[PDB]
Amino acid sequence: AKKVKVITDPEVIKVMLEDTRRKILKLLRNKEMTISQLSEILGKTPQTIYHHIEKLKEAGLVEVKRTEMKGNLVEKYYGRTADVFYINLYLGDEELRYIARSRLKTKIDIFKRLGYQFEENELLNIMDRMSQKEFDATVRISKYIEEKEDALKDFSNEDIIHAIEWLSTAELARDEEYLELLKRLGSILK
Amino acid sequence: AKKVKVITDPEVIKVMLEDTRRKILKLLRNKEMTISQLSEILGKTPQTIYHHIEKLKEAGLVEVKRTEMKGNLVEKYYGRTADVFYINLYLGDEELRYIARSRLKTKIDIFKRLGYQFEENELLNIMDRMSQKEFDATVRISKYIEEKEDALKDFSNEDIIHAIEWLSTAELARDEEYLELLKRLGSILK
């Protein structure tokens, strides 16, 4: 509904991954803002934010909540289509899988940079499987949350988010493959 | 240093837990802002933000980065003392333990509200132990990160944050008590 929204459309997911777009979405949680306000906060130019917002709008991630004649300029106030978004990078989309792997590899550079030694090929595989299991479990429970929103109107989105993590964690805990993957990680990363 | 800062002082931790203070800190990551700017974004009154900032300033969490004569009002620009803060609710401080338990109980109400049935006393204990282990592992690795900041200047704080999670997870994975706690959760929450 409006509190939580699960996204499985590879095209919108791809659009919301962009760095600035992310920051915009994070920002819009505070309240609906205009292209100017976002600009001032993000240290980004108005024209650039305009394009990002346009993209997010076209992706159904944001919408115009109201317009206002701010002096000599009529501006639109944008607000998120949902309080919290949940995505699954493991929806079978080839490009999404490689983005996930691109992200997991960045952290591996960090490990080696920090002095951790290991066989990067094995680690990436173990991280990718664990991450796939985690995304699938989180989508699974966030969907059930999404349909039970009326029963949670009395809770902050932060508490709801953290609750999903626990419920999701309890899920992974019933997955022996996951447990095995978790133990290998403990052996590989030291 | 400036990228990461681990906080073990119960008094500052207590100060940064306040809801609005949290939002302020989250906001200040984008850039240094004045009491007015925060106010407009947070939908909170200027005097109230003033008190929050004062508290955060007194807690060493924020500092004045520069002042500016904005028309008829001289304002201060506040910025975080560190890009990312890490806390440990399990530093032996009695009141902190109960705050942690207050938070874990909120999520249990959410579970029951969502239809999950279980013995709340056991769950709270299992969540608290798992959470204690997790906080201790994260503080442990974030400290090592804190001293190796020079080697990470080329990475975003987001990647660094996610890296700590993985390194921290690999840690918990070597803890058999944790593994057992993790499996009980899988049995308790369904």
Coordinates of C-alpha atoms in Angstrom, one line a residue:
Chain A
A1 CA 0.0 0.0 0.0
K2 CA 1.4 3.4 1.1
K3 CA 3.6 2.3 4.1
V4 CA 5.4 -0.5 2.2
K5 CA 5.8 -1.3 -1.4
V6 CA 7.6 -4.3 -2.9
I7 CA 9.2 -3.8 -6.3
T8 CA 9.9 -6.7 -8.7
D9 CA 10.0 -4.7 -11.9
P10 CA 13.7 -4.8 -13.1
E11 CA 13.3 -1.6 -14.9
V12 CA 12.2 0.5 -12.0
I13 CA 14.7 -1.2 -9.7
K14 CA 17.5 -0.3 -12.1
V15 CA 16.3 3.3 -12.0
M16 CA 16.3 3.6 -8.2
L17 CA 19.8 2.2 -7.8
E18 CA 21.5 5.3 -9.2
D19 CA 23.3 7.1 -6.3
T20 CA 21.6 10.5 -6.4
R21 CA 18.2 8.9 -7.0
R22 CA 18.7 6.9 -3.8
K23 CA 19.6 10.0 -1.8
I24 CA 16.5 11.8 -3.2
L25 CA 14.3 8.9 -2.1
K26 CA 15.9 8.8 1.4
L27 CA 15.3 12.6 1.6
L28 CA 11.7 12.4 0.5
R29 CA 10.9 10.3 3.5
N30 CA 11.2 13.4 5.7
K31 CA 8.5 15.2 3.7
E32 CA 7.6 16.1 0.1
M33 CA 10.0 18.5 -1.4
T34 CA 10.4 20.6 -4.6
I35 CA 13.3 20.2 -7.1
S36 CA 14.8 23.4 -5.6
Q37 CA 14.8 22.1 -2.0
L38 CA 16.3 18.8 -2.9
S39 CA 18.9 20.7 -4.9
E40 CA 20.0 22.8 -2.0
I41 CA 20.3 19.8 0.3
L42 CA 22.0 17.4 -2.1
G43 CA 24.5 20.0 -3.4
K44 CA 23.3 19.0 -6.9
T45 CA 22.2 21.4 -9.6
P46 CA 18.5 22.1 -10.2
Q47 CA 18.5 20.8 -13.8
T48 CA 20.2 17.6 -12.7
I49 CA 17.7 16.9 -9.9
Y50 CA 14.9 17.7 -12.4
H51 CA 16.1 14.8 -14.6
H52 CA 16.4 12.4 -11.7
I53 CA 13.0 13.3 -10.4
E54 CA 11.6 12.9 -13.9
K55 CA 13.1 9.4 -14.0
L56 CA 11.8 8.5 -10.6
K57 CA 8.4 9.9 -11.6
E58 CA 8.4 7.8 -14.8
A59 CA 9.4 4.8 -12.7
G60 CA 6.4 5.3 -10.4
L61 CA 8.8 5.9 -7.5
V62 CA 7.7 9.5 -6.9
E63 CA 4.6 11.6 -7.7
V64 CA 3.5 15.2 -7.6
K65 CA 1.7 15.8 -4.2
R66 CA 0.8 19.4 -4.9
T67 CA 2.0 22.5 -6.8
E68 CA 2.6 26.0 -5.5
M69 CA 3.2 29.4 -7.1
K70 CA 6.4 30.2 -5.3
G71 CA 6.9 33.8 -6.4
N72 CA 7.7 33.8 -10.1
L73 CA 8.0 30.0 -10.3
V74 CA 5.3 27.4 -10.1
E75 CA 6.9 24.4 -8.4
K76 CA 5.8 20.8 -7.8
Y77 CA 6.1 19.0 -4.4
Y78 CA 7.3 15.4 -4.8
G79 CA 6.6 12.6 -2.4
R80 CA 7.4 8.9 -2.4
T81 CA 4.9 6.5 -3.8
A82 CA 5.5 4.5 -0.6
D83 CA 7.1 5.0 2.8
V84 CA 9.5 2.1 2.3
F85 CA 10.6 0.2 -0.9
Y86 CA 11.8 -3.4 -1.0
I87 CA 13.6 -4.7 -4.0
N88 CA 14.9 -8.0 -5.2
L89 CA 18.1 -8.0 -7.2
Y90 CA 17.6 -11.7 -7.8
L91 CA 14.5 -11.7 -10.1
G92 CA 16.3 -13.5 -12.9
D93 CA 17.3 -10.3 -14.7
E94 CA 20.9 -10.8 -16.0
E95 CA 21.9 -7.2 -15.7
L96 CA 20.6 -7.0 -12.1
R97 CA 22.7 -10.0 -11.1
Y98 CA 25.8 -8.3 -12.3
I99 CA 25.0 -5.1 -10.5
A100 CA 24.6 -7.2 -7.3
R101 CA 28.0 -8.8 -8.1
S102 CA 29.5 -5.4 -8.8
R103 CA 28.4 -4.2 -5.4
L104 CA 29.7 -7.4 -3.6
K105 CA 33.0 -7.0 -5.4
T106 CA 33.4 -3.5 -4.1
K107 CA 33.3 -4.8 -0.6
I108 CA 35.9 -7.5 -1.4
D109 CA 38.3 -4.8 -2.5
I110 CA 37.6 -3.2 0.9
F111 CA 38.5 -6.5 2.7
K112 CA 41.8 -7.0 0.8
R113 CA 42.5 -3.3 1.3
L114 CA 41.9 -3.9 5.0
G115 CA 44.4 -6.8 5.0
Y116 CA 42.0 -9.8 4.8
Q117 CA 43.4 -12.6 2.6
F118 CA 41.3 -15.1 0.8
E119 CA 40.3 -16.6 -2.6
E120 CA 38.1 -13.9 -4.0
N121 CA 36.3 -16.3 -6.4
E122 CA 34.9 -18.5 -3.6
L123 CA 34.0 -15.5 -1.4
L124 CA 32.0 -13.7 -4.1
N125 CA 30.0 -16.9 -4.7
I126 CA 29.3 -17.4 -1.0
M127 CA 28.3 -13.7 -0.6
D128 CA 26.1 -13.8 -3.7
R129 CA 24.2 -16.9 -2.5
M130 CA 23.8 -15.6 1.0
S131 CA 22.6 -12.3 -0.4
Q132 CA 20.2 -14.0 -2.8
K133 CA 18.7 -16.0 0.0
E134 CA 18.4 -12.8 2.1
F135 CA 16.7 -10.8 -0.6
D136 CA 14.2 -13.6 -1.3
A137 CA 13.4 -13.9 2.4
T138 CA 13.0 -10.2 2.9
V139 CA 10.7 -9.8 -0.2
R140 CA 8.7 -12.8 1.1
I141 CA 8.0 -11.3 4.5
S142 CA 7.7 -7.6 3.3
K143 CA 4.9 -8.7 1.0
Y144 CA 3.0 -10.2 3.9
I145 CA 3.6 -7.0 5.8
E146 CA 2.4 -5.0 2.8
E147 CA -1.0 -6.7 2.9
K148 CA -1.3 -6.3 6.7
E149 CA -0.5 -2.6 6.8
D150 CA -3.8 -1.7 8.4
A151 CA -2.8 -3.7 11.5
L152 CA 0.5 -1.7 11.8
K153 CA -0.8 1.9 11.4
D154 CA 0.3 2.4 15.0
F155 CA 4.0 1.8 14.4
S156 CA 6.9 3.8 13.0
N157 CA 8.3 2.7 9.6
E158 CA 11.7 2.3 11.4
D159 CA 10.2 -0.3 13.8
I160 CA 8.4 -2.0 10.9
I161 CA 11.7 -2.1 8.9
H162 CA 13.6 -3.6 11.8
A163 CA 10.8 -6.1 12.5
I164 CA 11.1 -7.4 8.9
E165 CA 14.8 -7.9 9.4
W166 CA 14.1 -10.2 12.4
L167 CA 11.3 -12.1 10.7
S168 CA 13.5 -12.4 7.6
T169 CA 16.5 -13.5 9.8
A170 CA 14.3 -16.2 11.5
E171 CA 13.5 -17.4 7.9
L172 CA 17.1 -17.7 6.8
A173 CA 17.7 -19.6 10.1
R174 CA 15.4 -22.4 8.9
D175 CA 17.5 -22.7 5.7
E176 CA 20.2 -25.3 6.2
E177 CA 21.9 -24.2 3.0
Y178 CA 22.1 -20.7 4.4
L179 CA 23.5 -21.9 7.7
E180 CA 26.2 -23.8 5.8
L181 CA 26.9 -20.7 3.7
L182 CA 27.1 -18.7 6.9
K183 CA 29.7 -21.0 8.4
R184 CA 31.8 -21.0 5.3
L185 CA 31.9 -17.2 5.4
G186 CA 33.2 -17.5 9.0
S187 CA 36.0 -19.7 7.7
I188 CA 36.8 -17.6 4.6
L189 CA 36.9 -14.1 6.2
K190 CA 39.6 -13.7 8.9
Chain B
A1 CA 38.8 9.6 12.9
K2 CA 36.5 11.6 10.7
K3 CA 35.0 8.8 8.5
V4 CA 34.1 6.5 11.4
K5 CA 33.7 7.0 15.1
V6 CA 32.9 4.4 17.7
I7 CA 31.0 5.6 20.7
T8 CA 31.2 3.8 24.1
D9 CA 30.2 6.7 26.3
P10 CA 26.7 5.8 27.7
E11 CA 25.8 9.4 28.2
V12 CA 26.4 10.5 24.6
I13 CA 24.8 7.3 23.3
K14 CA 21.7 8.1 25.4
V15 CA 21.6 11.6 23.8
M16 CA 21.8 10.4 20.2
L17 CA 19.0 7.8 20.6
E18 CA 16.3 10.5 20.8
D19 CA 14.2 10.3 17.6
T20 CA 14.6 13.8 16.3
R21 CA 18.3 13.8 17.2
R22 CA 18.7 10.7 15.0
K23 CA 16.9 12.4 12.1
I24 CA 19.2 15.4 12.5
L25 CA 22.3 13.3 12.4
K26 CA 21.0 11.3 9.4
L27 CA 20.3 14.7 7.7
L28 CA 23.7 16.2 8.5
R29 CA 25.4 13.4 6.5
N30 CA 24.2 15.2 3.3
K31 CA 26.0 18.4 4.3
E32 CA 26.3 20.9 7.2
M33 CA 23.1 22.8 7.9
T34 CA 21.8 25.6 10.1
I35 CA 19.1 25.3 12.7
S36 CA 16.7 26.9 10.2
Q37 CA 17.4 24.5 7.4
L38 CA 17.0 21.4 9.6
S39 CA 13.8 23.0 10.9
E40 CA 12.2 23.3 7.4
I41 CA 13.1 19.7 6.5
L42 CA 12.2 18.1 9.8
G43 CA 8.9 19.9 10.2
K44 CA 10.1 20.8 13.6
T45 CA 10.2 24.3 15.2
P46 CA 13.4 26.3 15.2
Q47 CA 13.5 26.6 19.0
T48 CA 13.1 22.8 19.4
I49 CA 15.9 22.0 16.9
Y50 CA 18.0 24.5 18.7
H51 CA 17.8 22.5 21.9
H52 CA 18.4 19.2 20.1
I53 CA 21.5 20.6 18.3
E54 CA 22.6 22.1 21.6
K55 CA 22.4 18.6 23.2
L56 CA 24.2 17.0 20.3
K57 CA 26.9 19.7 20.4
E58 CA 27.3 19.1 24.2
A59 CA 27.5 15.4 23.4
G60 CA 30.3 15.9 20.9
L61 CA 28.1 14.6 18.1
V62 CA 28.0 17.8 16.2
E63 CA 30.1 21.0 16.0
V64 CA 29.9 24.4 14.4
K65 CA 31.7 24.2 11.0
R66 CA 31.2 27.9 10.2
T67 CA 29.0 30.9 10.8
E68 CA 27.3 33.2 8.4
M69 CA 25.5 36.6 8.5
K70 CA 22.3 35.5 6.8
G71 CA 20.6 38.9 6.5
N72 CA 19.5 40.0 10.0
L73 CA 20.5 36.7 11.6
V74 CA 24.0 35.3 12.2
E75 CA 23.6 31.5 11.9
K76 CA 25.9 28.5 12.6
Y77 CA 26.4 25.6 10.2
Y78 CA 26.5 22.3 12.0
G79 CA 28.2 19.2 10.8
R80 CA 28.7 15.7 12.2
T81 CA 31.8 15.0 14.2
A82 CA 32.2 11.9 12.1
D83 CA 30.7 10.5 8.9
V84 CA 29.3 7.4 10.6
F85 CA 28.8 6.6 14.3
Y86 CA 28.8 3.1 15.9
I87 CA 27.3 2.5 19.3
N88 CA 27.2 -0.4 21.7
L89 CA 24.0 -0.6 23.8
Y90 CA 25.7 -3.4 25.7
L91 CA 28.4 -1.5 27.6
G92 CA 27.2 -2.7 31.0
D93 CA 25.0 0.4 31.5
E94 CA 21.8 -0.7 33.2
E95 CA 19.6 2.0 31.6
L96 CA 21.0 1.2 28.1
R97 CA 20.2 -2.5 28.4
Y98 CA 16.5 -1.6 29.1
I99 CA 16.4 0.8 26.2
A100 CA 17.6 -2.1 24.0
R101 CA 14.9 -4.3 25.6
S102 CA 12.3 -1.6 25.1
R103 CA 13.2 -1.6 21.4
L104 CA 13.2 -5.3 21.0
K105 CA 9.8 -5.5 22.7
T106 CA 8.3 -3.1 20.2
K107 CA 9.1 -5.5 17.5
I108 CA 7.6 -8.4 19.4
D109 CA 4.3 -6.4 19.6
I110 CA 4.6 -6.1 15.8
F111 CA 5.1 -9.9 15.5
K112 CA 2.0 -10.7 17.6
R113 CA 0.1 -8.0 15.8
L114 CA 1.1 -9.7 12.5
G115 CA -0.2 -13.1 13.8
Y116 CA 3.0 -14.7 15.0
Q117 CA 2.4 -16.8 18.2
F118 CA 5.1 -17.6 20.7
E119 CA 6.3 -17.3 24.3
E120 CA 7.5 -13.6 24.4
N121 CA 9.8 -14.2 27.4
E122 CA 12.0 -16.7 25.6
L123 CA 12.0 -14.7 22.3
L124 CA 13.1 -11.5 24.0
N125 CA 16.0 -13.3 25.7
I126 CA 17.1 -14.8 22.4
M127 CA 16.8 -11.5 20.5
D128 CA 18.7 -9.7 23.3
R129 CA 21.6 -12.2 23.3
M130 CA 21.8 -12.2 19.5
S131 CA 21.7 -8.4 19.4
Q132 CA 24.4 -8.2 22.1
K133 CA 26.6 -10.5 20.1
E134 CA 26.0 -8.4 17.0
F135 CA 26.7 -5.1 18.6
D136 CA 29.9 -6.4 20.1
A137 CA 31.1 -7.8 16.8
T138 CA 30.3 -4.6 14.9
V139 CA 32.0 -2.4 17.5
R140 CA 35.0 -4.8 17.3
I141 CA 35.4 -4.5 13.5
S142 CA 34.4 -0.8 13.2
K143 CA 37.2 0.0 15.6
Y144 CA 39.8 -1.7 13.3
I145 CA 38.2 0.2 10.4
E146 CA 38.5 3.4 12.4
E147 CA 42.3 3.0 12.6
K148 CA 42.6 2.0 9.0
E149 CA 40.7 5.0 7.6
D150 CA 43.6 6.2 5.5
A151 CA 43.5 3.0 3.5
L152 CA 39.8 3.5 2.7
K153 CA 39.7 7.2 1.6
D154 CA 38.8 5.9 -1.9
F155 CA 35.5 4.4 -0.8
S156 CA 32.0 5.7 -0.1
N157 CA 30.8 5.5 3.5
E158 CA 27.9 3.4 2.3
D159 CA 30.3 0.7 0.9
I160 CA 32.3 0.9 4.1
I161 CA 29.2 0.5 6.2
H162 CA 28.1 -2.6 4.3
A163 CA 31.6 -4.0 4.4
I164 CA 31.5 -3.8 8.2
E165 CA 28.2 -5.8 8.2
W166 CA 29.8 -8.6 6.2
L167 CA 33.0 -8.7 8.3
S168 CA 30.8 -8.5 11.4
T169 CA 28.6 -11.3 10.1
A170 CA 31.6 -13.5 9.4
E171 CA 32.5 -12.9 13.0
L172 CA 29.2 -14.0 14.4
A173 CA 29.4 -17.0 12.2
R174 CA 32.5 -18.2 14.1
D175 CA 30.4 -18.0 17.3
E176 CA 28.7 -21.4 18.0
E177 CA 26.6 -19.8 20.8
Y178 CA 25.3 -17.3 18.2
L179 CA 24.6 -20.1 15.7
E180 CA 22.6 -21.9 18.3
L181 CA 20.8 -18.7 19.1
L182 CA 20.1 -18.2 15.4
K183 CA 18.6 -21.7 15.1
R184 CA 16.3 -21.2 18.1
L185 CA 15.0 -18.0 16.5
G186 CA 14.2 -20.0 13.4
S187 CA 12.1 -22.4 15.6
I188 CA 10.5 -19.7 17.7
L189 CA 9.4 -17.3 15.0
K190 CA 6.8 -18.8 12.5

